[PDB]
Amino acid sequence: MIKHRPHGIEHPYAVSPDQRVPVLPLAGEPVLLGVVAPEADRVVCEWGTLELPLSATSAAAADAAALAGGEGHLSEAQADGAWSVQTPPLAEPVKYRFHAHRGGAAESTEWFEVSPAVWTADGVGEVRGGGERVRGVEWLVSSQGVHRGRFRLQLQDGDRLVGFGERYDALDQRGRELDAVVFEQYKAQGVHGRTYLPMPFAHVVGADGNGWGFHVRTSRRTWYSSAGNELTVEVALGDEPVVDLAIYEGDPATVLTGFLDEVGRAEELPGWVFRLWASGNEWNTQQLVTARMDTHRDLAIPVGAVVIEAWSDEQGITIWRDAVYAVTEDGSAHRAEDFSYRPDGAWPDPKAMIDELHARGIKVILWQIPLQKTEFSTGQVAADAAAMVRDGHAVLEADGTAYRNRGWWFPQALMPDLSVQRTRDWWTEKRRYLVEHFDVDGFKTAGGEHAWGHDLVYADGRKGDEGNNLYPVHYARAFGDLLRSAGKAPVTFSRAGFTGSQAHGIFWAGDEDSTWQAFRSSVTAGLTAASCGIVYWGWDLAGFSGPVPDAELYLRAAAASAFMPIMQYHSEFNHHQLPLRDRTPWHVAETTGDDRVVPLFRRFATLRESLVPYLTEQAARTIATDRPLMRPLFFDHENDPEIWNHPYQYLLGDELLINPVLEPGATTWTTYLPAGEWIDVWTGDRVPSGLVTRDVPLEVVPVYCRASRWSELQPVFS
Ligand SMILES: OC[C@H]1O[C@@H]2OC[C@H]3O[C@H](O[C@@H]4[C@@H](O)[C@@H](OC[C@H]5O[C@H](O[C@H]([C@H]2O)[C@@H]1O)[C@H](O)[C@@H](O)[C@@H]5O)O[C@H](CO)[C@H]4O)[C@H](O)[C@@H](O)[C@@H]3O
Hints:
The protein is globular, with a radius of gyration of 27 Å. The N and C termini lie far apart (74 Å). It folds into 4 domains: 1-116, no CATH class; 117-264, no CATH class; 265-627, TIM Barrel (Alpha-Beta Barrel), CATH 3.20.20; 628-718, Immunoglobulin-like. It is built from 16 helices and 35 strands. The chain is of the alpha+beta class. Helix 5 links the parallel strand 22 (305-308) and strand 23 (363-368). Helix 7 packs across helix 10 and helix 12 packs parallel to helix 14 (597-625). Helix content is 23%, strand content 23%. The longest helix is centred in the C-terminal third of the chain and has 29 residues, at 597-625. The site of a molecule of 4 linked components (GLC-GLC-GLC-GLC) has 14 residues, from loops. The active site is at residues 446, 449, 511. It is found in: Cytoplasm. InterPro entries: AIMA-like_N, Gal_mutarotase_sf_dom, Glyco_hydro_31_C, Glyco_hydro_31_N_dom, Glyco_hydro_31_TIM, Glyco_hydro_b, Glycoside_hydrolase_SF, Glycosyl_Hydrolase_31. Substrate binds at residue 576. GO terms for molecular function: carbohydrate binding; hydrolase activity, hydrolyzing O-glycosyl compounds.
């Protein structure tokens, strides 16, 4: 047997051994041809009129690590039935196929074709809307059609580029190469410069004149680079060679208003989301969740929400673990009364647990994935999978078969097609009893990045090249709507999204190690996301992955996060080994032996509770004025050049300036205070504008209040 798939697995940053590299060669480029034929003595390619012998070797891989989820998931530095050959350069369309044989038994692949492409300024295609800001329009064309547009936006000296969704490497992207595509990068997002939540939108800000911004209106992939005075924008295309480009003019907030008016905006969430969120993945039973929350109560560390990740049967992920019930063969949803819960099960009485948590004022959030596992051939999970295919609730391959997940996380799983209302209904209907009976307050909607390939088909008419980036938006929206339909606020908690995600729930920065570098990246992620209109945002403070963080990093992160839109701690699945990897304050104290951790965390959490009315009012202003909640200084201060030397500072709402302590061992910290009158919130003293240095013991993160509103904020800090 011999396999060749010209596009391959379509990992957006990687190639697979069965494919053509590159998929679309420029004219003059050679192409590398991979093929997988596990048992073959010899493999040849019939390439045009030539015959090209294949060596046994693969492309390549550092890409196989990538296909396994990247370095965070896999090493195994090394350790495949793969063959490859490099062709002559491509001067024209070539038809090719492959011939292989094992010891005198031969096979032939189907014919394939590849047409070389060239960049040209000549064409019927147009870039609409950029006015005189756009120069150098070119199109990437082949005998097949127009594949991509490209053009340049004029920049002025002093201009910064801030935007592009949620970014972990830098606030200002000028001088860098980046793209916008939804991808799950497992940790080290800043290092790779990738993101779960890209947007083809940015602020152009800081030149003497008034600033502006742009939105490429596409859900297809886009690429960006800036050198000298130009920003280069490359746009993947569908059948129509048109790029529609929106330009917004004004101060940064007004620029944002134009964008959000077009693509959507946050609505006001209940004030309780501003309290502390407690989480960890290994709280997998009723006993564990109640024990952890009891410890919160007993240590007097206030918590407003608890996330339960492994709550479920781990199959369909819509039923409590150990619940007993009659499987519905037709794949229909269950009523609450379908279920009974055994005394010895993982969750003997989940309603009583939730009622008690509610009585203490703690909200409850359940984990979700937009995936139906196929690895089980029996039970409810299998009945629902069959129902998805039968009734058309599954995202489809070009050939009409159901898409099977190509990623490393739950491979082969189906994706519910959330692009249309009927399937959004069907999928969330299975979760309805959780909200209506069990009174669950939210969903942590994890994942959403799983759709790979350009020719996938969605029921809304879109193909995968357009629709795959949109999928996480549909995903958050679906569960938001479930909550609304039960009369509850649309609180979804999501890592992934795209243009339009602004209007659905809450977002967290995703998976990271516990390191100062990850801490710094996360701040940048919140700042850039806010610049694009993502209002309720948080991260896993001091990281959820690997060994428990040291006291210093933990407390630095906790202090800063108390000043961020969403304060949450979290911990990754450890295989239930001992010792625990919990990120709870008391387990961190236990692990480090540091007796400052619990009392100082308590103070931060206690101050946090006092900040809820302020955060609530500021959130409402953010939603009304589009001036961000976690606010880079260029929004109010844009003509001040000095602000760009302190990219990790921000305004929390109008009145408070925050300066996270981002390095280990720091006994002092310097803050740049822009034009205005300031007050150190810890001493209540007046402070002048400009650079200000103060001591930073662990109980302090630098915070300053506008003098005129300090009367309102003073009780919070007393
Ligand atoms: O990159 C894929 C994935 O990696 C991590 O999970 C790998 C893990 O998946 C399966 O076990 C999971 C378990 O890890 C946990 O997942 C909750 C987790 O999901 C997201 O992060 C994961 C990594 O943990 C990432 O997507 C999310 O961002 C994070 O906040 C969450 O904590 O719990 C679920 C449910 O119990 C479990 O299915 C798989 O079984 C396991 O073998 C694999 O190592």
